[PDB]
Tab-separated table of N, CA and C and ligand atoms in Angstrom:
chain	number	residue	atom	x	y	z
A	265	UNK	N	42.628	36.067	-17.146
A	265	UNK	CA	41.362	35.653	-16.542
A	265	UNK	C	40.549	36.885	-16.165
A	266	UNK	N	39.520	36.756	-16.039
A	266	UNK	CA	38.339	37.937	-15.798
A	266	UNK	C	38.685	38.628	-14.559
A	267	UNK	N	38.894	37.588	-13.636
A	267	UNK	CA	38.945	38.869	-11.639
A	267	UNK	C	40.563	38.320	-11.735
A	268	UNK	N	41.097	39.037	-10.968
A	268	UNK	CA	42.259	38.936	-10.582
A	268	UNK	C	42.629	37.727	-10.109
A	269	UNK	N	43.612	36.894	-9.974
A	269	UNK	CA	43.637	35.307	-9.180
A	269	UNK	C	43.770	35.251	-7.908
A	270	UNK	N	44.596	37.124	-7.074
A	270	UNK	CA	44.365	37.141	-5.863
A	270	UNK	C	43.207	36.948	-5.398
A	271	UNK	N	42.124	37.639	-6.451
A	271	UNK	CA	41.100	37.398	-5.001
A	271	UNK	C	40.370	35.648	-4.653
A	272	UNK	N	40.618	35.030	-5.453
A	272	UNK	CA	40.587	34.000	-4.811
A	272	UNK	C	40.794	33.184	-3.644
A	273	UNK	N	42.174	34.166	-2.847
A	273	UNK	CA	42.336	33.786	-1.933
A	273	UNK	C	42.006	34.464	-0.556
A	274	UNK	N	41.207	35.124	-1.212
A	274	UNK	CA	40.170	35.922	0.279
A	274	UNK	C	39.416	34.978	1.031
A	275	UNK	N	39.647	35.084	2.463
A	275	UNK	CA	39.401	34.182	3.365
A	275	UNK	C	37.799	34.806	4.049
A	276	UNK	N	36.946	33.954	3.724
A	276	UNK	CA	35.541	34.375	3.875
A	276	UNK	C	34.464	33.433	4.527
A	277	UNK	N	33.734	33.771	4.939
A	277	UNK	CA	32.793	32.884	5.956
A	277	UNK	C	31.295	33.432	5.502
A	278	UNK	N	31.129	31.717	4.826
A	278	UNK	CA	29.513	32.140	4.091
A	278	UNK	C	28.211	32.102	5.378
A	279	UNK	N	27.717	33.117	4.889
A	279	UNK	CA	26.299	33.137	5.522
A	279	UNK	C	25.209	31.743	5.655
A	280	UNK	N	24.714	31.375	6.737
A	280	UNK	CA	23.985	30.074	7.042
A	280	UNK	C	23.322	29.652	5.882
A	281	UNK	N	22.466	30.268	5.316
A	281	UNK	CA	21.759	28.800	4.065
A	281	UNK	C	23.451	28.359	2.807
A	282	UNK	N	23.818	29.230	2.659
A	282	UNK	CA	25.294	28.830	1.885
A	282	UNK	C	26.038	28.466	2.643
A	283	UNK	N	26.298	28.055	3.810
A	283	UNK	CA	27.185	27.309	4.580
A	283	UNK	C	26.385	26.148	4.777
A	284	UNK	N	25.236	26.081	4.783
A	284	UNK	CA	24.553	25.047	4.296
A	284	UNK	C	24.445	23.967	3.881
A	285	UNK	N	24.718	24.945	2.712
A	285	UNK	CA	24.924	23.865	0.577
A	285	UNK	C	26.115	23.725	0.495
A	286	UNK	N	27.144	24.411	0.850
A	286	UNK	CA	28.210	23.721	0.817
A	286	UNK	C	28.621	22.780	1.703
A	287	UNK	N	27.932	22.131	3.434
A	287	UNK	CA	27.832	21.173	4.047
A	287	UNK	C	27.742	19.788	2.847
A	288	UNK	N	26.465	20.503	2.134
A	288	UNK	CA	25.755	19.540	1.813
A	288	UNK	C	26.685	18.315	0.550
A	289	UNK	N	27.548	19.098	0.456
A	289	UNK	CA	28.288	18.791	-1.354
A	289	UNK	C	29.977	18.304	-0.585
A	290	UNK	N	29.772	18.566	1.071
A	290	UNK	CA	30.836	17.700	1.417
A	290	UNK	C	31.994	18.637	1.903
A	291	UNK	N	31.702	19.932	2.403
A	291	UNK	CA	32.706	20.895	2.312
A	291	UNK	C	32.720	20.753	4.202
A	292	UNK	N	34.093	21.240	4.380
A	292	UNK	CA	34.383	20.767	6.085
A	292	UNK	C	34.352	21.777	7.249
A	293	UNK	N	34.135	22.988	6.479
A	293	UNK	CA	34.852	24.074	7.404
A	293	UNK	C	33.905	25.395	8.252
A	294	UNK	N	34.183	26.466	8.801
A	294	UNK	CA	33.122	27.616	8.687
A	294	UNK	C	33.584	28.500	7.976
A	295	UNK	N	35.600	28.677	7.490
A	295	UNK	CA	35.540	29.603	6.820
A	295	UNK	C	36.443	29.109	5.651
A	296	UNK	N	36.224	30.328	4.540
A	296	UNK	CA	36.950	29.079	3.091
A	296	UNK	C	37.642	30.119	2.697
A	297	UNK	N	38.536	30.305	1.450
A	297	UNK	CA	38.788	31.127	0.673
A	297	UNK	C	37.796	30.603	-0.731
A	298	UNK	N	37.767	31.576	-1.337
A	298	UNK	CA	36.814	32.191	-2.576
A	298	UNK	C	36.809	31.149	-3.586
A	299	UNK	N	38.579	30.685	-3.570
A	299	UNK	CA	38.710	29.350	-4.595
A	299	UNK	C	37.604	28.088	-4.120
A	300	UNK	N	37.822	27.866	-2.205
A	300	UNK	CA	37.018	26.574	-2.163
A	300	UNK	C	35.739	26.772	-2.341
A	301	UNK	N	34.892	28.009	-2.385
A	301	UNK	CA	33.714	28.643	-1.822
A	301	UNK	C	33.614	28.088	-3.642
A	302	UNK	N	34.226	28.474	-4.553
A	302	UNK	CA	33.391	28.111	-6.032
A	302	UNK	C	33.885	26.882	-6.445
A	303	UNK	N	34.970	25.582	-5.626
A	303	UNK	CA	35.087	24.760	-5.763
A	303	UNK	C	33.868	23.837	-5.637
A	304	UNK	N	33.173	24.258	-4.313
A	304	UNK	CA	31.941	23.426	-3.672
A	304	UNK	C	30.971	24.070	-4.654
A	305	UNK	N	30.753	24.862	-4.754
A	305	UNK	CA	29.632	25.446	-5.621
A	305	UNK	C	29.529	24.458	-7.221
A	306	UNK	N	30.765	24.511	-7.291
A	306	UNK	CA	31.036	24.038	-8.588
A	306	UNK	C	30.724	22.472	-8.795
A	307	UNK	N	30.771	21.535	-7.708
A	307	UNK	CA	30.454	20.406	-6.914
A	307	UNK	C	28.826	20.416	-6.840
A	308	UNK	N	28.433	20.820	-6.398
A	308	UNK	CA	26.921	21.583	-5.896
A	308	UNK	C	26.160	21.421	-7.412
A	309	UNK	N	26.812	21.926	-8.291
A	309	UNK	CA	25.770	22.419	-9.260
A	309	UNK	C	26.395	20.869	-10.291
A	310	UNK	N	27.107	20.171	-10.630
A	310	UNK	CA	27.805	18.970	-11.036
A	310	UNK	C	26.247	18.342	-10.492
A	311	UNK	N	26.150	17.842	-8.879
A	311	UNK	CA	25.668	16.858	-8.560
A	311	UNK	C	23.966	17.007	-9.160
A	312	UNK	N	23.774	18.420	-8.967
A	312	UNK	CA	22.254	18.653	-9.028
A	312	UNK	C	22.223	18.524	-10.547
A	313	UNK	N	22.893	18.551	-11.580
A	313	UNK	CA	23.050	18.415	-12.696
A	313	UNK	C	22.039	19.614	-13.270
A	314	UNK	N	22.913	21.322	-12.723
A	314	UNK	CA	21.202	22.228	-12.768
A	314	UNK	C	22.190	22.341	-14.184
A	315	UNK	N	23.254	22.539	-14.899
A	315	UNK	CA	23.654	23.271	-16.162
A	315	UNK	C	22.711	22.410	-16.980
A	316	UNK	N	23.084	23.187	-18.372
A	316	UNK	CA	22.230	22.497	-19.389
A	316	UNK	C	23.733	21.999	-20.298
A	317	UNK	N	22.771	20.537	-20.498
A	317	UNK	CA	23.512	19.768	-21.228
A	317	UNK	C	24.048	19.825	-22.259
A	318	UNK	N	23.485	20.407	-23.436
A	318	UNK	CA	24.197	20.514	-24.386
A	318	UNK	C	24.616	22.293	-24.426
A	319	UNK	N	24.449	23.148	-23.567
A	319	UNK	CA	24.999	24.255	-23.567
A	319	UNK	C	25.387	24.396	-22.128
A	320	UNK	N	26.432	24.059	-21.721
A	320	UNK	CA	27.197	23.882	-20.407
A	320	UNK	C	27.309	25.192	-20.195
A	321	UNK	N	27.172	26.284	-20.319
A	321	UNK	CA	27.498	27.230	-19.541
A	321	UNK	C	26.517	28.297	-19.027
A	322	UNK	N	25.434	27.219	-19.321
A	322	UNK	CA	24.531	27.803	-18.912
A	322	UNK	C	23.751	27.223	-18.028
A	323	UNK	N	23.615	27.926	-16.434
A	323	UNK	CA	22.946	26.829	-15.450
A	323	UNK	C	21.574	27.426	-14.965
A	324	UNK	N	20.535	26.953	-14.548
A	324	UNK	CA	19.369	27.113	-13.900
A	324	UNK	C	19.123	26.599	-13.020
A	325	UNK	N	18.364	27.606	-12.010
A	325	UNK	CA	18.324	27.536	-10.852
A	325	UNK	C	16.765	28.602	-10.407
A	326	UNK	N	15.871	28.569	-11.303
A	326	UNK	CA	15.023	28.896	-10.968
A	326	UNK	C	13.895	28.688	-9.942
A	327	UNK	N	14.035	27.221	-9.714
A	327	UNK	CA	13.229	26.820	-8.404
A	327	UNK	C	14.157	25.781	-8.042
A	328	UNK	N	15.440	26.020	-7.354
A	328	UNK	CA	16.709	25.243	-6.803
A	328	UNK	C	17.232	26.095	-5.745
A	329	UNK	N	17.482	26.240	-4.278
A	329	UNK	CA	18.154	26.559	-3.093
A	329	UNK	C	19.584	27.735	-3.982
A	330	UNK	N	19.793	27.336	-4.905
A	330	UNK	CA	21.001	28.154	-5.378
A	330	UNK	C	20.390	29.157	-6.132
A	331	UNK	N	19.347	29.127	-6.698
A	331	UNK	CA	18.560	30.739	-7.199
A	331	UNK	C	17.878	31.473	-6.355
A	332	UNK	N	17.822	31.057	-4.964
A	332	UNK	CA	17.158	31.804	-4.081
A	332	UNK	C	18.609	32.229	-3.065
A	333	UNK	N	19.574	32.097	-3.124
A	333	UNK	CA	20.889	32.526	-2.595
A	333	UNK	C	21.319	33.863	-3.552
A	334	UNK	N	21.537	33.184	-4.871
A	334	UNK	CA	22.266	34.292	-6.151
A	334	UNK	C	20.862	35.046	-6.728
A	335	UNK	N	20.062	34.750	-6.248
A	335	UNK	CA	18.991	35.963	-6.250
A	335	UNK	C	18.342	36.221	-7.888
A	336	UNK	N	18.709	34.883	-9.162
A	336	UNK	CA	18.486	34.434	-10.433
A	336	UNK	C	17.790	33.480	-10.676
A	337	UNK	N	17.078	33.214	-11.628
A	337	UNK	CA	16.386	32.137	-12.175
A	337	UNK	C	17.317	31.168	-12.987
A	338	UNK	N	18.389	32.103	-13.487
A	338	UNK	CA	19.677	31.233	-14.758
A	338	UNK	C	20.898	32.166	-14.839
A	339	UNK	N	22.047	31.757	-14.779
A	339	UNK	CA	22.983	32.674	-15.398
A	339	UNK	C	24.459	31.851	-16.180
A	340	UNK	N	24.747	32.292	-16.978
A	340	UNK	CA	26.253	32.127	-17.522
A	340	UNK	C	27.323	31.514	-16.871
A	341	UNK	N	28.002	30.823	-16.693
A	341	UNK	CA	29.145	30.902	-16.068
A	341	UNK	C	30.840	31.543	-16.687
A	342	UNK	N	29.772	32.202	-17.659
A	342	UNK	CA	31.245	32.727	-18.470
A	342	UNK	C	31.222	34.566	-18.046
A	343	UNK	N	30.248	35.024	-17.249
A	343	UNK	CA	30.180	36.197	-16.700
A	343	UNK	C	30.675	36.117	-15.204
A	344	UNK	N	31.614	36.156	-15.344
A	344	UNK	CA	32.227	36.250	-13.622
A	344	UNK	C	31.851	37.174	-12.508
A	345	UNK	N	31.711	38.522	-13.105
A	345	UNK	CA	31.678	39.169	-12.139
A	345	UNK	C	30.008	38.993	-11.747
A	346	UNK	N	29.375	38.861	-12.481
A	346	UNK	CA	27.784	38.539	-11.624
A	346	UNK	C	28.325	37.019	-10.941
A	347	UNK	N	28.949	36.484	-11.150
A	347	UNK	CA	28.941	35.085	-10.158
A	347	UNK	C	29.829	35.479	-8.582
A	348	UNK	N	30.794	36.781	-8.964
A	348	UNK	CA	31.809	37.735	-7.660
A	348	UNK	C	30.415	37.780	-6.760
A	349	UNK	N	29.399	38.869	-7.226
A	349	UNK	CA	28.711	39.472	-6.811
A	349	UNK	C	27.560	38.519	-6.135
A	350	UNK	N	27.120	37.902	-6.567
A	350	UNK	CA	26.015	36.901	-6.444
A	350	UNK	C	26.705	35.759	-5.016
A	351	UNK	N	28.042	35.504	-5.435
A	351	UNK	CA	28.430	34.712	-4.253
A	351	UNK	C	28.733	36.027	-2.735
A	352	UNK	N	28.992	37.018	-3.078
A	352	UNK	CA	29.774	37.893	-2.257
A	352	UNK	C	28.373	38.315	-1.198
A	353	UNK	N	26.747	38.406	-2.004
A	353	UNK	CA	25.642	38.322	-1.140
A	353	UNK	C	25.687	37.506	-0.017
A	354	UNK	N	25.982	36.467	-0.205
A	354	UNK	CA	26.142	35.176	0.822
A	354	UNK	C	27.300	34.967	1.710
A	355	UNK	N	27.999	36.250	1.821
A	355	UNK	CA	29.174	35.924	2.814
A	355	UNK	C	29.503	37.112	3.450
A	356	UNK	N	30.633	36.675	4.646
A	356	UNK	CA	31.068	38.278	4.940
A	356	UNK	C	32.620	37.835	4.924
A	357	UNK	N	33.205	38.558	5.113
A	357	UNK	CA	34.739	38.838	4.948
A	357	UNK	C	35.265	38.276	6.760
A	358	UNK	N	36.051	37.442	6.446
A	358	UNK	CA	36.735	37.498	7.851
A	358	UNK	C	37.810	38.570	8.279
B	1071	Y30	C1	28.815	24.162	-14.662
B	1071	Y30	C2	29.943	23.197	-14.322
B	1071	Y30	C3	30.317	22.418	-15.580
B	1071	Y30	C4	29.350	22.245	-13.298
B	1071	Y30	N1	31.073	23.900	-13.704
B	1071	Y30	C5	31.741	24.920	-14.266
B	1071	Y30	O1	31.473	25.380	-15.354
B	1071	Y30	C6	32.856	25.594	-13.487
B	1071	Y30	C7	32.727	25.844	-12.020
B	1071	Y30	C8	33.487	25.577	-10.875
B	1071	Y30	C9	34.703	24.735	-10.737
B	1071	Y30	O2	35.209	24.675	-9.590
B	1071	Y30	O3	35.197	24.149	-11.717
B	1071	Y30	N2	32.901	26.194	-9.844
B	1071	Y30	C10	31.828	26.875	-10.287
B	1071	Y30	C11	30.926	27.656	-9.612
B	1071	Y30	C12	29.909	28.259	-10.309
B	1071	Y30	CL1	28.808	29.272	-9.367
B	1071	Y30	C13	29.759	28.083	-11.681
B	1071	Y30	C14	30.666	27.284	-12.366
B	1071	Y30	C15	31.698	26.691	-11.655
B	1071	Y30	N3	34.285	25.585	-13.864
B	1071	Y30	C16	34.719	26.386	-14.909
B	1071	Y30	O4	35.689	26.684	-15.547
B	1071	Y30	C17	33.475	26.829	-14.249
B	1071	Y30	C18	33.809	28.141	-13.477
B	1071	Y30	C19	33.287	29.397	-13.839
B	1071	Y30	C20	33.580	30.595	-13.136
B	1071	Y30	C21	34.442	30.596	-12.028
B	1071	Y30	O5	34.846	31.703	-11.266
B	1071	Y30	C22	34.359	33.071	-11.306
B	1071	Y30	C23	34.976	33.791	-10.117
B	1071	Y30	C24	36.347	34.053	-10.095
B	1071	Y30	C25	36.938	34.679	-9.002
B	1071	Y30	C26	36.133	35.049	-7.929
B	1071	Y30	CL2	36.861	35.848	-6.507
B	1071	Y30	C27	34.759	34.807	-7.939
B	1071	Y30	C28	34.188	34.175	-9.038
B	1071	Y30	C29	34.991	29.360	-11.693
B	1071	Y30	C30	34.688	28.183	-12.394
């Protein structure tokens, strides 16, 4: 896999508009590890139905609450480390 599987389990506490969106998609807590933090995300972007349909790995978010967090108009989900980086804006480390 692209990042290591440890870091998934870094225990992290997202910053208010991303503690937010993940309220919003049903998430319970103030602090998550990295797995639940792209579980809800992953939830998040399902419901808003932002990917594109016949090319799933590609999502937009150009005028959506989640491109003004990851700081993009669209990106890949097959590039991980801009999705590390992009989520890692929105949090701090407990
Ligand atoms: C677009 C769609 C169909 C609604 N979901 C997925 O594609 C996807 C997914 C999930 C998921 O929980 O399945 N969560 C996602 C979050 C984002 Cl930001 C983008 C995609 C996902 N699940 C994929 O296999 C895609 C996914 C892609 C990257 C990913 O992780 C990158 C990463 C690894 C480790 C760290 Cl520490 C940080 C980031 C996790 C899941």
């Amino acid at each position: 896999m692209q990042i290591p599987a440890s870091e998934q389990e870094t225990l992290v506490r997202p910053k208010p508009l991303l503690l937010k969106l993940l309220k919003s998609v049903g998430a319970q807590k103030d602090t998550y590890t990295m797995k639940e933090v792209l579980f809800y995300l992953g939830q998040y972007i399902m419901t808003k139905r932002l990917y594109d349909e016949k090319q799933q790995h590609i999502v937009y978010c150009s005028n959506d609450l989640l491109g003004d967090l990851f700081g993009v108009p669209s990106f890949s989900v097959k590039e991980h480390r801009k999705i590390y980086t992009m989520i890692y804006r929105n949090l701090v480390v407990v």
